[PDB]
Symmetry: D2
Subunit: 351 residues, 4 copies
Amino acid sequence: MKGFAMLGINKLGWIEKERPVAGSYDAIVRPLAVSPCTSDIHTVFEGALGDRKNMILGHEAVGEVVEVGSEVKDFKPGDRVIVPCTTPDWRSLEVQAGFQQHSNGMLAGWKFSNFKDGVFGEYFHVNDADMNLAILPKDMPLENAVMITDMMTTGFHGAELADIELGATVAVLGIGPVGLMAVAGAKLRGAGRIIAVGSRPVCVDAAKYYGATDIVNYKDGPIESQIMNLTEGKGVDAAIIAGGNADIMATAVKIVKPGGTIANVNYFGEGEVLPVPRLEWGCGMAHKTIKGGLCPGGRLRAEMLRDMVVYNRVDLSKLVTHVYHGFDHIEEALLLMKDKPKDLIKAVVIL
Amino acid sequence: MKGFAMLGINKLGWIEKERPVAGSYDAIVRPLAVSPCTSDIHTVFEGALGDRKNMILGHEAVGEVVEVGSEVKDFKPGDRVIVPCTTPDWRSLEVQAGFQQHSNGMLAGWKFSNFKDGVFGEYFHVNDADMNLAILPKDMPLENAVMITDMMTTGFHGAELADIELGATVAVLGIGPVGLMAVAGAKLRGAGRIIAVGSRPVCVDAAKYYGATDIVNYKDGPIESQIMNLTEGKGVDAAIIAGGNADIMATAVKIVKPGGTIANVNYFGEGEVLPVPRLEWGCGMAHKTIKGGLCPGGRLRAEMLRDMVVYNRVDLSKLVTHVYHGFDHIEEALLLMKDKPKDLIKAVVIL
Amino acid sequence: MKGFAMLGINKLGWIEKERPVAGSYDAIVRPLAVSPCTSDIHTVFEGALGDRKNMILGHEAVGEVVEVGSEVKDFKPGDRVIVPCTTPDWRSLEVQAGFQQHSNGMLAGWKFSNFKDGVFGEYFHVNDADMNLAILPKDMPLENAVMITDMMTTGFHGAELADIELGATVAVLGIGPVGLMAVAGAKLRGAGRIIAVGSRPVCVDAAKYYGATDIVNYKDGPIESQIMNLTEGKGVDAAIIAGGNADIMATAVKIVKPGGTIANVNYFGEGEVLPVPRLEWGCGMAHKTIKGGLCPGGRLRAEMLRDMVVYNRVDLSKLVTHVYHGFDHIEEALLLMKDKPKDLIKAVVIL
Amino acid sequence: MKGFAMLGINKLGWIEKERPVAGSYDAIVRPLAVSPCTSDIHTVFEGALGDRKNMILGHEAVGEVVEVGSEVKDFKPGDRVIVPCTTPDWRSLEVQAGFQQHSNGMLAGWKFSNFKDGVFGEYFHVNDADMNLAILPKDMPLENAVMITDMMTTGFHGAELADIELGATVAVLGIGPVGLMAVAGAKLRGAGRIIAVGSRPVCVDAAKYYGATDIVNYKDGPIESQIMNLTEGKGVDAAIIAGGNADIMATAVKIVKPGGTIANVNYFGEGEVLPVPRLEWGCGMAHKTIKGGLCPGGRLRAEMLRDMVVYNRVDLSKLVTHVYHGFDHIEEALLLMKDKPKDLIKAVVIL
Ligand SMILES: C[As](C)(=O)[O-]
Ligand SMILES: C[As](C)(=O)[O-]
Ligand SMILES: C[As](C)(=O)[O-]
Ligand SMILES: C[As](C)(=O)[O-]
Ligand SMILES: [Cl-]
Ligand SMILES: [Cl-]
Ligand SMILES: [Cl-]
Ligand SMILES: [Cl-]
Ligand SMILES: [Cl-]
Ligand SMILES: [Cl-]
Ligand SMILES: [Cl-]
Ligand SMILES: [Cl-]
Ligand SMILES: [Zn+2]
Ligand SMILES: [Zn+2]
Ligand SMILES: [Zn+2]
Ligand SMILES: [Zn+2]
């Protein structure tokens, strides 16, 4: 079977592997549409989760079930499915503690292109199909569906972590596709003022679409001072980190008011320490809670998000700026995420 | 000073009282626009909070500050203000425990036309002005502003109490103005499917506007069975009670799935017991949490809600179906709430 | 295989059934020590969960694993195990929503002597052994261990549901073994004053041991008035319901202060409605949250509770008032729970 | 009036000031017993909250009310009172948001020897007496009472922030008096295993008394590896930081399991950045929540803690290792906190 892989740190290529086989509770799925992610660039080009050998990349797919194990009851060959990027082992003690994302170890609910061969292959394997898949609606555009699997869940998780009160003022630091979904998620948690920080015009337009009331361009000067000035020295109720380097932790702390929340969903690839500033964290005592969480997955999450899309709670179409046709364009698509052209949000390859 | 009052249970009339005087921390406010509430009908005509003598009614007003005490710093004569219907005593132990609504006793944060002369008078008194008032924006229509003071805060509080996950399915039982705001609030907590229960066409149109995906008319048959059928036997994640008689508690319990929330914001005036059904409450063990809460007030709540309106998170204009001009029309306006014409949601009297 | 069963409502007897067989993920366990529960009296003699045919009773056991399925990795034949009375299906959507106790339906995480043949048999079946068993410590008395499986988890769950702040005043309504564990659990959530309501001297002594600061005997007069008098009209922060008839709901509501919690863990068998009083529930608005929950189970819960016992956080020995030797005494033991002698808390049959 | 003061950074001395006067809502209190705090050493000798001029030190006192304002109703001259070190302005928007500790600005609920003349004076001023004082019980030893005002509330707040499940494994980093109270607080939140990190024998004995099951001495080697070894590679559910330098943040992150909580109550005086390690924080995604909070105060907190002591939930006497008699010994007492003799936990000066 063919797949586009991380040969090792800094090295991409097409490889050939054995087609995976389903256990009693698993499914084999062939991709129908896929998207590459900035996370795979951190993983390959920064070595941010350590080295790998011949790991097929990608974790954002809608697919067709081709094969299911003997104990699979709700999915069958031919079913069209939304595959959440996080596919936990539901039989784990971490699940019993309330942390599906870390079933059997830190980040280990997120398998695809963390450590498990991903979706950029002729087929891929889903553990526990009945618990980790959702049916794709008949009329749902594939490219919008693909945005559910990671961008929507992660951005929304930033808003969830932020523990927003109705009418809260929220800053979103970074308006790549995850931050855009954080903007929309903040709105769908009842945020009033939403201050989006970023400068790429395509992203700014999308941020405004999704609910941003204010846009902060770092080229006008320090972000901290800009935000403090917008809020008349009060700061924000919550800051969602959806991108940046290590220093953005310190920025987030400095703009959040006492009692507020810093909610990280950014995958940091560079810097071995994320700085928390002493004075602006109240020398340890400011009740500025710092969170940082991998997106939830599983069937329940996938269905609930899917149904938000069905009921027009968010329009995912705005994220999709590039569409390609055919398996081979996966390569070109991933390299867009590396190279970062001004007009890109997300790319989808429809096979 | 003139006001429209509860003479006692079942008896309304205009009365004359001394104009109130501000303590060091208080304001005297003259109404600019007011709305009557169904709660005052429960209070007067059902005796639902006990008898009263000569209590001026009303608790929904935007006003002009005419006089402030010596220790008031943020409001001054001439300021135009949104007055939250709940005006807590902030120096109370209940506030220290996190329950502003019950400062100095059960429901005692809600003063106006609970026990304190209300807003249907030439002037009224606000305790602790700096903590219990918000500035009215220059361009904000008075009639929309008045909807902040009770309908928005109460309906939104139903959504808050419901403890909705992103993508949850919510039922709203009753689509009077409080239920309409519960619909909008559920949407602004990220609800997917929102099932609104009610039959008055004006309310149904508003419910759909505010985010209802499904409408349930009791004239088609039992509500429980209808809802269970819509959700394919799963029930709903949360049911918000925004109206009905005592029996609606039992309905709410029967439609909520195990682990879900029944969130009441209805002011019950009739029936001395609200029934919780044994079997459908899992004989005590179904984790169906039952909440029932008075709306928050105070300056912070008022400002945060006001700012949600400024940033176009909700459009309150749809609630206002009747507008009158002049103090004397307060009487006619309140009697609309008693008589309940098919085309009424809320009435506002602009003085 | 022999077991002591519910023949049907009002009818007990010994029966013969096929010995159960383990699926790939299950274990067959033979009891080493067992206890009967008041819940089985509700189930059999009140028909509180509907009729049954030939259901082996009991859900409180420590056992020896005799057989495990091919996919079981952490338990093996010969292992001595604490079996939590609640053994969820971990692969369920309710688990994904955070409600293990209702995996695959209301109460359906609690299988043994709800609907599944229980522990009063020569052998019983545990679903998903690796996720639903805990190792019994070598030196832990069997009879103390058995108290973990239901009494400790349920009583502690009442304290968990009560959402106690450090220093809160808690009432416990009923001091049978579940209420006794609620007393201990309240103490281990940092309760200050703990007011235990009950009159059996053996239970009173145990309540005082476990942390009760005040004892209320209903024979001295109405409980509501007694509690209100003890707390100088303030009421309690939380009331845990661990026994009583339907009316105790109303008592609990009347003694809890505004903003407080009524936390039920009682299995109600009689009365089709549990009354919530209108005026004392603030006509729907008093923020008196009413909870009612089945005890958690699974391996994680079992291990965490076991380790609390290992570290001397609670002494379970006080609950065990009667010990019998041999399988046949199960019958006599269960009938004690029906007949309720003054000196009984819990009975354990050591096989 | 005489007081022992921070002349400025690095400079202590006795000074003379005007005796303060009560506003309508305030009290003037004369100390009956006082304790010095390590925080005042950070403040004076590290300049950790910036420079000061002639600020009377100390924030741990039991006193006698000598004078009250005209609007004070619950306290009067002669009353003996426990003064919480945190005395919020209850009329603030931060209080409305749920953060009394930051009323009118970051840390600004903690006034005494942060910015307001403290308790090491012939008299001191308490803002809002009715909301910020508690009656001292007649038979309560003064020196035990003084431990309520800061050590108990702060250490307990570390346990509160840790959001401990019943049976959780907790590490406490630092076993000075705050960490000792964190140990006791963890126990009173139902912790099972409690791993206390420290090496001073007097503190170790107290840690064991208060509930520590394991003691970790850094002189045996790296703390991280020791803790990971104790927990068999699982890490701890929560780590409470009650002392250390800046690096302890990174240690806390490395020992907490995914989904766990790092709960800081340490007042950091040195280092401008507290490091959060990238890999062990799951590159931003490990759901290791980092909290850091000033202790709550006010009358409600003071009464609830006082009542925990009355009901023998914790014994504070173990903290008091040194007692002096007479106002002048304040100087000697504070310098003990600077110099740190092996046998010191807390010192109390009884005037
Ligand atoms: C599954 As991911 C860290 O790219 O949001
Ligand atoms: C202040 As009201 C009970 O009418 O929402
Ligand atoms: C498992 As039970 C309802 O007897 O605590
Ligand atoms: C009031 As303090 C920071 O010394 O615990
Ligand atoms: Cl975990
Ligand atoms: Cl992104
Ligand atoms: Cl309260
Ligand atoms: Cl209404
Ligand atoms: Cl569920
Ligand atoms: Cl019991
Ligand atoms: Cl705040
Ligand atoms: Cl300390
Ligand atoms: Zn991704
Ligand atoms: Zn009203
Ligand atoms: Zn039982
Ligand atoms: Zn201190």
